[PDB]
Amino acid sequence: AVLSFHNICYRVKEILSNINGIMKPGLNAILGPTGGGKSSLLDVLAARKDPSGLSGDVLINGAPRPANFKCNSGYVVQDDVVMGTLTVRENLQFSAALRLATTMTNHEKNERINRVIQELGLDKVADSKVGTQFIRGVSGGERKRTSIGMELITDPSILFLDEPTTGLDSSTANAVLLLLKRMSKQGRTIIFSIHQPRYSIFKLFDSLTLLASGRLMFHGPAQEALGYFESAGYHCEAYNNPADFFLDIINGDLIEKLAEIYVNSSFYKETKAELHQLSGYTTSFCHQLRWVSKRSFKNLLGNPQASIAQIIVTVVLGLVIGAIYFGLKNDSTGIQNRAGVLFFLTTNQCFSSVSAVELFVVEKKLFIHEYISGYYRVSSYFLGKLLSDLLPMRMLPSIIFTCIVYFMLGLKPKADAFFVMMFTLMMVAYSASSMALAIAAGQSVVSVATLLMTICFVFMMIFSGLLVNLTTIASWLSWLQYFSIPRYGFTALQHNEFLGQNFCPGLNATGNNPCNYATCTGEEYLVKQGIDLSPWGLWKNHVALACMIVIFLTIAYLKLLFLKKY
Amino acid sequence: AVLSFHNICYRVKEILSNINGIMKPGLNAILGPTGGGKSSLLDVLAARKDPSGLSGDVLINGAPRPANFKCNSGYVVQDDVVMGTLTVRENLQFSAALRLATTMTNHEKNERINRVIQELGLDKVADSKVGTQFIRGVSGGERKRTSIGMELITDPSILFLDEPTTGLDSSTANAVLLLLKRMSKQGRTIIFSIHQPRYSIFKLFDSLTLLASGRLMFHGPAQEALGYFESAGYHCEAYNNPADFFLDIINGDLIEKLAEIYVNSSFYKETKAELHQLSGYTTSFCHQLRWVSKRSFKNLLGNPQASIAQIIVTVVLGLVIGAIYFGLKNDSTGIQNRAGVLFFLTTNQCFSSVSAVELFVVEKKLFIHEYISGYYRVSSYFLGKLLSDLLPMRMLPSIIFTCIVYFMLGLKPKADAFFVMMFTLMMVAYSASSMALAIAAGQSVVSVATLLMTICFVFMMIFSGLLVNLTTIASWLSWLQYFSIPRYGFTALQHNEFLGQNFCPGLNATGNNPCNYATCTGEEYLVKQGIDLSPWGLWKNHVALACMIVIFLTIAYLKLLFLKKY
Amino acid sequence: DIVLTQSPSSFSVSLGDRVTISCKASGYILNRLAWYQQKPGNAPRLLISGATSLETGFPSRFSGTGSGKDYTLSISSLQTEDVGTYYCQQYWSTPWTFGGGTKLEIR
Amino acid sequence: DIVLTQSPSSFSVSLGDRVTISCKASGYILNRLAWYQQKPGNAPRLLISGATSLETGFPSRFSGTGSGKDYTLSISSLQTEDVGTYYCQQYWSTPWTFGGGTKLEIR
Amino acid sequence: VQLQESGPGLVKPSQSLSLTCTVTGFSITSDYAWNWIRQFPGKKLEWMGYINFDGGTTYNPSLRGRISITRDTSKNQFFLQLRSVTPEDTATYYCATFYGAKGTLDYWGQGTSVTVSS
Amino acid sequence: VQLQESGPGLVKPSQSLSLTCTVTGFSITSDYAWNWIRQFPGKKLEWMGYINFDGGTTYNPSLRGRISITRDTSKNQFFLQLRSVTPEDTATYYCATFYGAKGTLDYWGQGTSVTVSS
Ligand SMILES: CCC(=O)c1ccc(-c2cn(-c3ccc(CCN4CCc5cc(OC)c(OCCOCCOCCOC)cc5C4)cc3)nn2)cc1NC(=O)c1ccc2ccccc2n1
Ligand SMILES: *[C@@H]1O[C@H](CO)[C@@H](O)[C@H](O)[C@H]1NC(C)=O
Ligand SMILES: *[C@@H]1O[C@H](CO)[C@@H](O)[C@H](O)[C@H]1NC(C)=O
């Protein structure tokens, strides 16, 4: 299999002019300075950019590129996108269960894994965890071996590496490339780009393309690249790396001067006479949701210190509120206490949902490369990770608050009023978490969104009803009291709990209330805050929250759907 | 001047064994892998580590190292520690104002700087801003040119660069090193270390020391370093970097095998016969506090988007609280609103002072390198930057919250109560800021301290008196209500504001209160919260916060004083 | 605000008869309701405070039994001097609206 | 809690004389103070509520003028039937402490 | 306990309106709130606004800016000052008394009638 | 409005104590709170604890765990149940009545005396 590209004018600003060449099965290479097209000609030939900038044609063996080009070729990201909490056996099963056909047996699927991991020489680390901040794992020299094998699953004809040596040691990098040249003799074409190689690296290549500042400066065999620049009018001294010598000519021991020398080359015409010789989903839905939710759940178990910690904080802050507010008294101070803790329990659900920004932001570079390669659909990605991360880690702490503080404080001692409180803190937990997915989706930085979640809640906190009284806001602001998540929770806990209570000892007020301005029953507190007494007035909040969940997750759906994928 | 070191055994685990060599005036370089001693031999010879680990001697021209060695030598950090928001003219005046004595004239000191900046060739950027993220500044190839001149102010004989090429471009670094060889012929003994140089770099050296894994593996003239290893048993091919060839030996084309080869050298024996021939504050306190506070004040004005922003945040949020709580009524809802806004103001002062963690953490490596260089005292650093950054950026928002909302809300319209509220928000802003310096100072990460500031406030917030009633906590938790900064401000604001008020319209209650459980006056709200009515009870809160400033800044001082400076 | 409603805007009763006047609210009042009796040509005079209690200066033929939103007033065996105009008042919020008022008649 | 103090633990007065009993608190009470009069062999009977108001069944020779912490009781021109025991009560907090009580005498 | 209105029984349109209620038998700075109630023909009563015992006041939001209530504590009077009058509010005006802790309009004035024509 | 204590006038130490106050003329589940007041010889009165009209209760923290107050709404009685008695509290016991919105001990029982000896 060979590539052949011709007359590409890529723009966003044309940062490419006209680049020509074939790529034989061997060791194709792209060298140059980081400002040039060493990372942009690669993404064009790997179909990773916008096709609107594309001008020329990219042909395979006489055939132009189909839409099956991505599923028939492997691209490997510069940094590792591997699941550092899964083992290499687990990741290669995950890649196999989403890319290969469903007709294959697991006994067929395991052997295809077993050939690859032996081809990578990874039998000694075959069940070792890869490595996280909190788990000692396999060294960085074989994380790169893992990621290449993730794209060796389909056994493609064409491989795309992006900087396979940047980030490793020099003794590490030769071990990677010697493995690659052994792949090159098997018939798999390898296309990569190295930042500043060594002569021990450069002695192994089979074809070289030297790019700088959007101009093709060399194309041909890498052995004849040094002798070309000897015949170009330069001299390479003794004991010098030729790859350093190639970038030495770039910076002046000028760009358009050196390109025109390449125009009059015998290597250019041989490329020119060759390019005219040639010129003239897979898997169903429910299967995708099974393996994706399986993956993120082991990620949730495999990183305990981000998930156990939210349980421990919930228990400890559960007990302290249980200790401070120990059994509440039906006296004049009872209204201040009961409306205090219910304001603390609702707002605790909101501000602890700022950690849900971490959900799609850290997974973003993994989300993009898996979707362009097409392991799943976006609708299948979204319903899985909601089921795996968001759904259990919010059901748990809302029960832990509910089990601890309810009978220590001594709230309304009925059957349903225990469960209505439990259900309410569950709903307000999702709604604040859904707003986090509404904002944090698509962005790549954490601190801008983590700021912005803090901004939105402290305005929602004002209108909740404890700081300001919601009946006496000026009328051109009292429509903002509908846009706040914590109001609907805090109203529901107030409606659940202040019904049959009394707060003036010695004074039966629920038949007649002489001497008013008194607030001697729960209703007179509950009306003065502007809250309905009907049983609809309870459940009006829950349908108000549930509508906010569906809207915010839809916004969370579409922002992943319309993202700049290229 | 010459260095000479002999028989160094440094420990923390002995990651150095026995290293011997002199460093003549010329260009002294240290190569090797990053795990070896290329970063730790430099810190020993520049007196930057603990002398409790050091064993061998360091001699200079026949004399051991005095206490004046940290002031008569220049050490240059790897990354830039320069004030990126100032200019190069102002930075070199800052280094001159704290190292040269007070005898010299400003005419004398500026000519010395003109000697430097003409020698560095920075005439075209002599009055240009250096560079931040928010300011387009001088290029990274000349920030390094700026920082080296900061140590050239005393015109020292001995220079210590730490990786002067790492981070620059390859064509960028040749401009730096050719300057250094032009510095070398002035007679300045230049000592540094390079992560993997180039042969265009390596041809400029004068003396070379190869270290790996705590063992001296070569030390001599850099010209013969290639010729020594051909006699060792290794062959260097043509078109190969000699510097990369040296680390190729380290990784095996073993450590103790190659080390004893160097002990039996003809070069080690010439070195061994050389050592035995040789062997056998500055400025007043008031002057320092000017220039430290002067530099950081320009840093405050030179970064608008971190300082002008908090003015904008103050005014905008100040208008919103002015809009929601527009003029407060003296009715039954009036108590809930007035205690609502006053709770929002005191916690807005506390929770926004988490930004003070940025103060001592970002400037930490500049603080450490300067104090070893001894530009100032730790007493002088700490009193200056508080006078420069913390003092004005907390006086401003407490006035703007005071000026805007006090007449939109229509609080108690007397002369003093405007200023008692103004003073109260200022102290609680300092008290929370002092706690932030009490935690942040000494740590190097932002996020761990920022999370710990977040946990400390939400427990202080419960005890403030709005959520729980303070007089009904059980008595074995009620001792905790004194540790809480938002209690003291909020207690003071409630005392400033509920004194001469009434809240049952039509009902004079201040002579007699019939029909109790009423809260018909400001005292009855104020006593039921557990707050004194005597004018001591107000100011008790201010002398409480004034003590918490003095305690926390002291803890902040001692953590800076007892820091591991090495 | 809180608007009030006396949907029986008139009556036509006989002497000694038990009549009942209903007053409907646009919200919760929680027994903060009143009743006034205006003869033709005088100021309104308070009849019932708090929707149950009664004022000194009236016989116990008047009685109010209110709960939640539906407040009512019952005159059992009305005399001749009970003809007039009746109003209901909320005093829960600040803009103290009254009811539209009803006017008894004799056939 | 709130402990109370009647530092005049006794008196020795004459008939028709103006006597004054002081009651000192260990905190603020804000006029939530009371007075009881216990004859020997009976239950305590309420005398003054709210530290100023007076109860039906006593002449207007009794009067309380309290403010802040220093509450007091004044009997102008005491009769013979005003001998007995007097107590002051806070009803601000929940553990309703009383004063220690004082006992008038005639010389 | 004892109230009495007084004022001009006729006024030009769009000029002003002033009334005066002189309370006897009580001191208006002592206890109560004091308020104004007007009654349109085609009887629908309508509350206007109160002044507190300590000079504070609160007005009906239907009558924005047109009404202001001031008092003279020297002789127990409190003044209604209604500006920019329309010929629609030719009502019967009352000064009344609000206990606060009982919550009802306990005492009512004799009542004066104001007519706005030309 | 009408209260009356009854119970044993003597008891062994460290056994129990039971009293009974039968309210006539009113229903104890209607309005008031109902509480117990004891009076030591060498007269210093001391309040013990109340039961609310709706069965809730609140006890003096000086008497922790030793006191419990229950009621029988069928015949308007409410019971004092004092356990682990010391011979120090040989006081005079009273059942009393608390209005709540007035705040004073408005009505007081006849009063019974309990002596703890052997
Ligand atoms: C005008 C807009 C604006 O600028 C703005 C407006 C207001 C504020 C603002 C609002 N505040 C606030 C916060 C909370 C409260 C009430 C307390 N409630 C209630 C209960 C509770 C419970 C919690 O649970 C324990 C909890 O904790 C959460 C859970 O934690 C668990 C941790 O587990 C993780 C495990 O990891 C190991 C938190 C809470 C918090 C009140 C005020 N404070 N500041 C900040 C603003 N921006 C900036 O200042 C800013 C800064 C830098 C910038 C830089 C550049 C540019 C601009 C920049 N701008
Ligand atoms: C309060 O009194 C009303 C009648 O005044 C009565 O319906 C009710 O039962 C009483 N409350 C309780 C808890 O018994
Ligand atoms: C309330 O009434 C008392 C009478 O005891 C008087 O002293 C006081 O001045 C009155 N309040 C005001 C604000 O005038």
Side-chain angles (χ1 to χ4, degrees), chain A residues 239, chain B residues 202 208 218 221-234 236 242 245-246 249 265 267:
Chain A
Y239 296 100
Chain B
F202 183 75
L208 178 57
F218 185 74
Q223 184 178 4
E224 294 293 326
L226 181 62
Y228 179 70
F229 283 152
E230 290 292 331
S231 177
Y234 294 93
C236 183
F245 184 77
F246 292 163
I249 299 169
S265 173
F267 293 156

Side-chain angles (χ1 to χ4, degrees), chain A residues 309 313 317 344 347-348 351-352 451 454-455 458-459 461, chain B residues 305 309 313 316-317 344 347-348 351-352 451 454-455 458 461:
Chain A
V313 171
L317 193 59
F344 186 76
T347 58
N348 205 175
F351 290 95
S352 65
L451 175 66
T454 310
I455 312 303
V458 305
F459 286 105
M461 191 179 74
Chain B
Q305 298 293 320
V313 172
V316 169
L317 186 59
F344 186 76
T347 63
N348 195 5
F351 281 96
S352 65
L451 181 62
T454 303
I455 296 299
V458 304
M461 194 184 75

Side-chain angles (χ1 to χ4, degrees), chain A residues 3-7 19-23 45 209 216 219 271 275:
Chain A
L3 269 294
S4 67
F5 57 91
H6 184 271
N7 207 170
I19 305 172
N20 304 115
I22 65 169
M23 287 181 182
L45 271 76
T209 296
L216 175 61
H219 181 74
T271 302
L275 291 174

Side-chain angles (χ1 to χ4, degrees), chain B residues 502 508-512, chain E residues 29-31 53-54:
Chain B
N502 297 117
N508 184 10
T510 192
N512 187 3
Chain E
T29 186
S30 172
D31 197 4
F53 60 93
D54 58 351

Side-chain angles (χ1 to χ4, degrees), chain A residues 171 199 226 236 239-240 251 317 325 332-333 336-337 340 343 463 465-469 504-505 515 517-518 528-529, chain B residues 171 199 236 239-240 251 324-325 332-333 336-337 340 459 465-469 472 504-505 515 517-518 528-529:
Chain A
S171 64
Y199 180 73
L226 181 62
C236 181
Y239 296 100
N240 192 2
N251 292 319
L317 193 59
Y325 294 89
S332 65
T333 73
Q336 185 181 2
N337 292 120
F343 182 73
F463 292 98
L466 185 61
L467 300 179
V468 70
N469 198 4
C504 292
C515 298
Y517 295 143
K528 193 182 261 78
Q529 297 294 320
Chain B
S171 65
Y199 182 73
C236 183
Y239 295 100
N240 192 3
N251 292 318
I324 297 170
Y325 297 92
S332 69
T333 72
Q336 185 181 3
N337 293 117
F459 285 101
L466 183 61
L467 297 179
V468 70
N469 192 3
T472 60
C504 293
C515 301
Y517 297 146
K528 191 183 261 77
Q529 299 292 320

Side-chain angles (χ1 to χ4, degrees), chain A residues 502 508-512, chain F residues 29-30 53-54:
Chain A
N502 299 114
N508 183 11
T510 189
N512 187 2
Chain F
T29 186
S30 172
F53 60 93
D54 58 351

Side-chain angles (χ1 to χ4, degrees), chain D residues 40-57:
Chain D
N42 297 116
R45 184 179 179 181
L46 178 61
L47 184 62
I48 281 177
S49 69
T52 59
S53 298
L54 193 144
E55 293 294 325
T56 61

